[PDB]
RNA sequence: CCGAUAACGAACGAGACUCUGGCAUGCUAACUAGUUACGCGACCCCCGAGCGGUCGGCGUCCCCCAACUUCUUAGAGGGACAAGUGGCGUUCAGCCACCCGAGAUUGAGCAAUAACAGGUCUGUGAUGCCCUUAGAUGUCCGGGGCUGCACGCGCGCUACACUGACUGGCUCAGCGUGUGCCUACCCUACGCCGGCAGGCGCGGGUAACCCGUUGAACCCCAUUCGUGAUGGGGAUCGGGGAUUGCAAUUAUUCCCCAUGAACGAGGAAUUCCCAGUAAGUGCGGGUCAUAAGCUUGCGUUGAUUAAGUCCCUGCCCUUUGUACACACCGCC
């Protein structure tokens, strides 16, 4: 075997990312593996505001740079074994990964 | 019918004068349980006439500074004044709105750029939508002044204000500087 | 006020109106649907901005003869 | 001095214990996010890192 | 009951070495004694079990004298000992609290003995100028011109 | 200075572009500097597609 | 026709409870209540002498609507505005001595005891005093 | 116009005149007692809540900020 | 007798501020989060909140059973959000279970007196700049 | 776990390491014509790719 | 942009573009988000209600042991275009009002040719030239200084009070951060001690999992004060106690008890501003071992006036005059 995997994929593109979220549970469905839908967690933006000259003289001009960080979360909860069904993980640059099993 | 503040039903006043009839909100369209909508009144000319004139005054009676955003505290000085005119009175509060309105607006002033002998030069008479936003702020900052160092509250300073105002004695502040405005107008004709 | 139409758009729907007249109506829906499949216009509010202006070209071509 | 004195005076905190890790200046630190990076040399390597101009 | 002025009301009593007020109230009236602040009167009040709500020139005699005995002597009546003025003295350790001109005396006196070593503190303070360390670049010129 | 730029924006024009512009600045012929531009084709220079449009070095 | 203290006035309730502490001669009361300010950003002491019925009348009715608060999470609720005089304004916690008393002789009292988590709340017995003084005062604001 | 210098307790020739005119207009509140028999005003809020209990003056209000009494209907 | 199955949730929004409304056939019954309308905050402003039962009457109310939560915002926007979400889950509940004819002439009450009621207020609020205090003021400027 | 990093500072790091190894790809391979880097990062190892022009050097 | 047109074909900028806000009971999903439904509780009822009411009390991903996405989150899509009507307009370009509509002008980012002897060599292993280079202008260490005060100016905070202050109760937010390569320095629930600043142990959280339903402030509801430099104001100053650091004196910060100074709406002038705006009001980030009166963002309450003009200060296009071209701060 009984096994049960949280999945976690974190980002900093949609593009790429709802891509391997499309492929990897597409490939589920023909495994027929039971798998939760994806778990859009919010996105936690990184905001720095920074003067833009470099030295301090001018009108008071910042510049602010956002970094957005998606994750979503997909489970897949087949009744028998997981692991040696899917030992493929078909990533591409830019996706950060994490398995986890259901016990941690 | 409406029952504002609970109570002072509006299909008894009236607007004895044509030319602010259709300007004041005092009619059963714009007759409101509470002086109290954020109906975005500052969207277009032309859309603070059909805002309440109760709304309106309450709207006008935060200033100074420290009252700028309060506006719970401005309706329940204002439900206390009405009740209060009521009681002194004895006739609707907001037919004494309406009297001291029509009485306090200036009819005429002066306005110029160039020379001018004592204020302004030329006389030019007064819109009506300028005669009701100028007898509001005038009511207010008469209360506002009389009120500002002495024990009477804005409640009851509020009130000899308007009632002063509906009969006309020239102790009003809004009809003071009304008569003041009109022979400055008379001069500069 | 502020709602002139530029070069982009105003030369587009005049390219595709005379070319596609029989494809084309009245209507800003329907046009701003037949616009998709003739014209790659990569953006949304580009395309139902030309499609407001076809209907109204189509409005006075139906009448009278229009420089396209 | 010798090796008792020449780096002997605490440096465990403050500006004087943090430097840039580009320009090696004690100066305009970004220690957010574990930067640690200078205020002028964050605007230069900003596109690289990630950080972009949205609004 | 709002009744009229009691016929032994002293419209200015006469406390130590000062006058307070007998038409405010007795917890704000004290406080015109040099040293008896607004929260010092409202807890001697409190344990000499007098009423707040009448105002303090319809004290009796006897109620008066009793605050300042009470004031006088804050250590033998449950008054706490971060409570006082002159907590862990200079010059002998106890823990006291004055509350007439020998405030300004005792004042006096740690003035001459800052000065006496002459501390930083001390020559500021015969010079006239901040002690606390604020910047003196723009601010305290009202007294100077 | 001249000629150099003229081989590298003939070059990369060559190759395949809508458009290059290439700015050399700094102290050239006298002590007093200056700033010698030499553009060619398309170049836009606002908004978000000059993000993708366009290789800046 | 049952009467819930979430049915009725909140302040009216505060006072009804504080008189019925103040009745029954069970709340552990401290020695320093004439003395000690409620919140260190408050400058005075209260008028009413018997504030510390009003605390705990006000944490009973706290703690009917949620639990699980100890020291630092009831000093929150009761937490206000220090002008800290030339400075700008802040947000200051109130005394954590004294919370922390009126919730130590609530248990005294048995109507709060702690969770197996952090943080206590109210015992069956305590539910039902508090809303017994509900019923009363409802009947009361009615009639 | 420099200090009020207002009563802050009641004297025989003030409390008479609190006791017979001062319930017979419309408007009675704590700050027009107050400017008128030149009394304090925290004496006037407690001496019209007195008439409260002696039943001659109704209360309408009862605001913290405004609270405002009536004389007796007449007639 | 015992039809179940008879529930609709409607929410309004103002200023930030979200209330959900369960409206369900029942007896007349009005509370928002657990307390009746009545014994609400703000006192000064509770017409407001009793304008929506007072333009319909108590008749439209009677088989009417509503609980409202609110998760968010400020004191008044709290009021707002609760008085749009009664009319709009009453609305909604003649639009769906009983003919539209009834909702009709419930409708044009509420859109009438104030449109508030029925469509929320799009403005939230506004960005502050790097220029001033403020999102459009500016910091004070000196030349000398 | 408390080994591992938080995502919001783990990728500020990973933009770092791309900086960095874009400047050190650029200094030690001027002459040779570098253009850029790319980075192909699995869990089990990463690979770094050294776009250039001229190969050869 | 339409139209004329010795021009035609173009290019950049503007627009277009990206992000952000507002409608989607339409779609995909959600035990790190919840809502209904059901079953246990716990309490108030009981005259009896009984599907009565309430609970952030517990359960139904403690996988066969509920459904659902409205609320919440975030992706794919739609939706708004001068689209419809009337008037105006060469009836063209477009303009005005209105119905229906969530919206009929949401705010920002980016932002052209050319230029300034504008600012930065104190951001850099960016750097030319000059200077110093061992009694160093390298570097380290100790102390002081950058704080210093007859005075002037600038940005701000606090107030001058009763639309208030004090005391108690009530009761609602959203950005965002939180344990570290070097690098030591995290965000903190709960229990106990103390009056407070604080201290001691259990923990949790590398985070929609914990802080945290961020029980914010303002405001609201009651008390006291009562037109006085008063219970407004807290400047200056004494004593005492903790925390951070190796070091707190020239007081780092915080707390408590003491004093209660000017200040009663401020001359000439002058700043900013049009709708969720000003203003009131607090909360995060940056700085930080210690810390905000600074700044950068967020949230609550929420208006008055105006939908115009070139009068003042300026800007653009055309014509015009010029003895100006370092360009009227010119020339003479
Ligand atoms: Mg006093
Ligand atoms: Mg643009």
Redo the contacts with the bound molecule.
């Keep these: 075997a ?1 096994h ?1 995997i ?1 999945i ?1 994929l974190t980002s900093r593109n ?2 790429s ?2 891509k391997v979220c499309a492929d990897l549970i597409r490939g589920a469905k023909e495994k027929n593996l ?1 798998v ?14 920074t003067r ?7 009108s ?5 740079f ?1 970094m ?1 960080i ?2 979503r ?1 997909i ?1 897949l ?3 028998s074994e997981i692991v040696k069904q899917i030992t493929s993980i078909s990533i591409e640059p830019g996706v950060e990964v994490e398995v986890t099993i ?1 016990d941690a | 019918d409406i029952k504002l503040f609970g109570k002072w039903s509006t299909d008894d006043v009236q607007i004895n004068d044509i030319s602010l009839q259709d300007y004041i909100a005092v009619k059963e369209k714009y007759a409101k349980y509470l002086p ?3 109906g ?9 006439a059909q ?1 309440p004139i109760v ?2 005054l ?17 309706v ?2 204002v439900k206390h004044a009405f009740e209060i005119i009521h009681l002194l009175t004895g006739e609707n509060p907001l037919q004494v709105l309406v009297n001291a309105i029509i009485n306090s607006g200036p009819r005429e002033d002066s306005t110029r ?1 160039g020379r001018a002998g004592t204020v302004r030069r030329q006389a030019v008479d007064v ?1 009506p ?2 005669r ?2 100028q007898a ?2 005038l009511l ?1 900052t008469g ?2 002044e009389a ?9 009851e ?1 509020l009130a000899d204000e308007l009632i002063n105002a509906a009969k006309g004695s020239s102790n009003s502040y809004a009809i003071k500087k009304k008569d003041e405005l009109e022979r400055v107008a008379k001069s500069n004709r | ?11 587009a729907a005049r390219v595709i109106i005379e070319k596609y007249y029989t494809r084309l109506g ?4 329907t046009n ?2 037949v616009c998709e499949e003739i014209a790659i216009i ?5 395309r ?2 030309i ?3 076809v ?3 189509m ?2 071509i139906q ?2 003869p229009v ?1 396209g | ?1 010798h090796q008792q ?11 004087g ?9 004690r ?8 930067l ?1 990076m ?4 964050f ?2 390597y900003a596109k690289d890192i990630g950080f972009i ?3 | 009951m709002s009744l009229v002025i009691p016929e032994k009301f002293q419209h200015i009593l006469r406390v130590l070495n000062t006058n307070i007020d007998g ?3 007795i ?3 004290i ?11 409202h807890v001697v009040l409190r344990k000499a079990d007098i009423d707040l ?1 009448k ?1 303090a020139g319809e004290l009796t005699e006897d109620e008066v004298e009793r605050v300042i005995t009470i004031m006088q002597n804050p250590r033998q009546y449950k008054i ?11 010059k002998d350790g106890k823990y006291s ?3 007439a001109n020998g ?1 300004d005396n ?2 006096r006196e ?2 001459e ?2 000065k006496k070593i002459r ?3 001390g020559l ?2 015969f ?19 | 200075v001249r000629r150099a730029c003229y081989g590298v924006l003939r070059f990369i024009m060559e190759s395949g572009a809508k ?1 290059c ?1 290439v700015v050399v600045s700094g102290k050239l012929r006298g ?3 200056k ?1 010698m ?1 030499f ?1 060619d084709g ?9 993000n993708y449009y366009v290789d800046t070095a | ?7 009725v006035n ?2 009216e309730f ?2 009804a409870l504080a008189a019925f502490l103040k009745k029954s001669g069970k709340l552990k009361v ?3 209540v004439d ?14 002498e018997n ?1 510390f019925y ?2 705990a ?3 009973a ?2 703690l ?35 919370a ?2 009126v ?2 002789a609530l ?1 005294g009292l048995k109507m709060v005891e ?1 969770d197996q ?6 015992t ?2 305590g ?6 003084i ?2 009363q005062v409802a009947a009361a604001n009615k009639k | ?6 009563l ?1 307790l009641f004297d025989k020739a003030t409390y008479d005149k609190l006791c017979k005119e001062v319930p017979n207009y419309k408007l009675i509140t ?2 027009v007692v ?1 400017e008128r028999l030149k009394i ?7 001496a019209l809540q007195e008439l409260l209990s002696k039943g001659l003056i109704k209360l309408v ?7 405002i009494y009536t004389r007796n209907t007449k007639g | ?4 199955l008879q ?14 409304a ?1 409206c ?1 056939r ?1 007896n007349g ?1 009005i ?1 928002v ?3 009746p309308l009545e014994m609400i ?4 402003l509770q017409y407001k909140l009793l304008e929506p039962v007072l333009l319909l009457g108590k008749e439209r109310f009677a088989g009417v ?1 509503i ?1 409202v ?12 959000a609760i008085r749009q979400s009664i009319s ?2 009453l609305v ?1 509940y003649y639009q769906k279970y009983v003919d539209e004819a009834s909702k009709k002439e419930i409708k044009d009450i509420l ?1 009438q007196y104030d449109r508030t009621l029925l ?26 | ?10 990728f500020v ?1 990973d933009g ?1 390491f791309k900086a960095e190894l874009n400047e050190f790809l650029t200094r030690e391979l001027a002459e040779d014509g570098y253009s850029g880097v790319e980075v192909r990062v699995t869990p089990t190892r990463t690979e770094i790719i050294i776009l250039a022009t001229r190969t050869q050097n």
């Design positions: 009984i049960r949280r976690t949609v593009k990312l709802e039971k939760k839908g994806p778990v859009r967690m919010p996105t936690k933006t990184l905001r720095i505001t833009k000259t470099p030295c301090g003289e001018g008071k001009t910042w510049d602010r956002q957005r998606h994750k979360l489970d909860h087949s009744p259901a | 109290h909508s954020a975005r009144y500052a969207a277009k000319r032309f859309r603070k805002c709304e309106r309450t709207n006008s009676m935060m200033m100074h500074g420290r009252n700028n955003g309060k506006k719970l505290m401005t329940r000085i750029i819109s939508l300028r009701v936003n509001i702020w207010c209360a506002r009120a500002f160092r002495n024990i009477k509250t804005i409640a300073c | 006020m502020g709602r002139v139409r530029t070069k982009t758009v105003k030369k009245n209507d800003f829906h701003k649907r990569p953006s949304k509010k580009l139902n901005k499609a407001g202006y209907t109204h070209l409005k006075r009448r009278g420089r | 001095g004195l020449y780096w002997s005076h605490p440096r465990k905190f403050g500006q214990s943090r430097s840039c890790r580009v320009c090696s200046n100066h305009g630190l970004i220690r957010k996010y574990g640690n200078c205020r002028q040399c605007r230069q101009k949205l609004d | 038409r405010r109230k917890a704000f009236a406080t015109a004694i040099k040293g008896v602040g607004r929260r010092y009167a709500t105002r706490p000992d971060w409570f006082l003025n002159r907590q862990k003295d200079v609290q004055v509350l405030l005792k004042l740690d003035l003995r800052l501390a930083h503190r500021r303070h010079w006239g100028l901040r002690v606390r360390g604020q910047h003196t670049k723009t601010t305290g010129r009202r007294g100077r011109t | 458009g512009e002590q007093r500097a700033s531009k553009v398309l170049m836009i220079h606002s908004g978000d597609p000059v | 026709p049952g009467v819930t203290v979430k049915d909140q302040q505060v006072r401290p020695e320093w003395t000690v300010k409620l919140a260190k950003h408050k400058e005075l002491a209260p008028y009413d504030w009003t605390r009348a006000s944490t009715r706290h009917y609507l949620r639990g699980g608060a100890g020291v630092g999470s009831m000093t929150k609720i009761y937490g206000g505005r220090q002008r800290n005089g030339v400075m700008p304004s802040h947000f200051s916690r109130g005394s954590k001595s004294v922390r008393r919730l130590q248990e702690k988590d952090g943080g206590r709340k109210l069956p017995q539910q039902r005093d508090l809303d017994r509900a019923g | 116009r420099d200090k009020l210098n207002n802050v704590p700050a107050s304090r005003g925290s004496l006037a809020r407690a209000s009862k605001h913290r900020a405004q609270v | 007798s015992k039809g179940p529930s609709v949730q409607v929410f309004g929004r103002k200023k930030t501020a979200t209330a959900v369960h369900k029942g019954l509370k989060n657990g307390r905050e703000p006192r000064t059973d609980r939560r609110v998760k968010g915002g400020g004191h008044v926007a709290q009021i707002y709009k889950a909604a859109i469509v929320a207020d799009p403005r939230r609020c506004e960005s502050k700049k790097f220029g001033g205090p403020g999102a459009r003021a500016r910091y004070q400027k000196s030349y000398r | 776990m408390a080994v591992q990093i938080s995502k919001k500072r783990k790091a770092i």
